[PDB]
Ligand binder design. Structure first.
Ligand SMILES: Cc1nc2ccccc2n1Cc1ccc2c(c1)nc(CNc1ccc(C(=N)N)cc1)n2C
Ligand SMILES: [Ca+2]
Lengths: 55, 235
């Protein structure tokens, strides 16, 4: 058995949307879903939601 | 912002400012993209015409990085009425694309489901602006921020003398003297999830500022997501 975006957002860096039994993650426009189907890689130099500081 | 902290270098990159003819920042906004700024519909009244300043962190000194943009089109919500303050939302399109740089970056828009849950579920949100610092006081010259806890709808309604519609939500303190204020209207209420920030609401109104027993109320962006997309594709 496997299900629940409640466990811990389904290990998604951002959007989590359970389908059937899997977690199925998504990324905000400007991010690309990592090959692990969980992480969200920033595409541009200044992705949304990120603090543009001396990071 | 009444009794809040100061926004440091690159801490509040999505903050935009609505300056009138005399360059007076009468309201705030949230940077959505190169062209779109999200704001409160009622703010479109305190000026016959205005501009949007971005990268501004201190209204006084011009430390560069500040950039003014002209509004091309103003998409206001057709259901907004001062008699109810419901549907207090409006999207602004600028003639020139906003250049992203230190202290200038958009905020991420979430999805209705996973916002209503996960985001609204969080216990606190971030709000900011160049508005009054004490109610019956000066309007801040430095961009201030403040962590405002999420207030449940029922207590919210019970505290507000006016009807809290489903397109609204309370956030603030009951006793602690911290809360957004006049001049912060249209400003962003973002919510952090892990390391990214998603726009959850915009400063709409409230009864006084940091008023004991009252909370600051915001526009529930969640309810307007599709409208935002509509307006970004232009409609
Ligand atoms: C006069 C009235 N008729 C209403 C009908 C429905 C809901 C509220 C109503 N009000 C009170 C009201 C309505 C709108 C208001 C307001 C006070 N005060 C502001 C100015 N901005 C503002 C923003 C944040 C805060 C705060 N969180 N303390 C306080 C004030 N706006 C933009
Ligand atoms: Ca400045």
């Amino acid at each position: 058995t496997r299900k629940l975006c409640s466990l811990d957002n389904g290990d998604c860096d951002q959007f989590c949307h359970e389908e059937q039994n899997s977690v199925v993650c998504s990324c905000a426009r400007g991010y690309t879903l990592a090959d692990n189907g969980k992480a969200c890689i920033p595409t541009g130099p200044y992705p949304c939601g990120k603090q543009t500081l001396e990071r | 912002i009444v009794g809040g902290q100061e926004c440091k270098d690159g801490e509040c990159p999505w903050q935009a400012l609505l300056i009138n003819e005399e360059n007076e920042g009468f309201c705030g906004g949230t940077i959505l993209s190169e062209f779109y700024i999200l704001t409160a519909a009622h703010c479109l009244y305190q000026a016959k015409r205005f501009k949007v300043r971005v990268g501004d962190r201190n209204t006084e000194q011009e430390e560069g990085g500040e950039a003014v943009h002209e509004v091309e089109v103003v998409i206001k919500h057709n259901r907004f009425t001062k008699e109810t303050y419901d549907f207090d939302i409006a999207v602004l399109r600028l003639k020139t694309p906003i250049t992203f740089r230190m202290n200038v970056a958009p905020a991420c828009l979430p999805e209705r489901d996973w916002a209503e849950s996960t985001l609204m579920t969080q216990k606190t949100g971030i709000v900011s602006g160049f508005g009054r610092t004490h109610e019956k006081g000066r309007q801040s010259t430095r961009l201030k921020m403040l962590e405002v806890p999420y207030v449940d709808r029922n207590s919210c309604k019970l505290s507000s003398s006016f009807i809290i519609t489903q397109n609204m939500f309370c956030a603030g303190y009951d006793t602690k003297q911290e809360d957004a204020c006049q001049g912060d209207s249209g400003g962003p209420h973002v919510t952090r999830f892990k390391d990214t920030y998603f726009v959850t609401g915009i400063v709409s109104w409230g009864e006084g500022c940091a008023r004991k027993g009252k909370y600051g109320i915001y526009t529930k962006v969640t309810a307007f997501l599709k409208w935002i997309d509509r307006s970004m594709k232009t409609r």
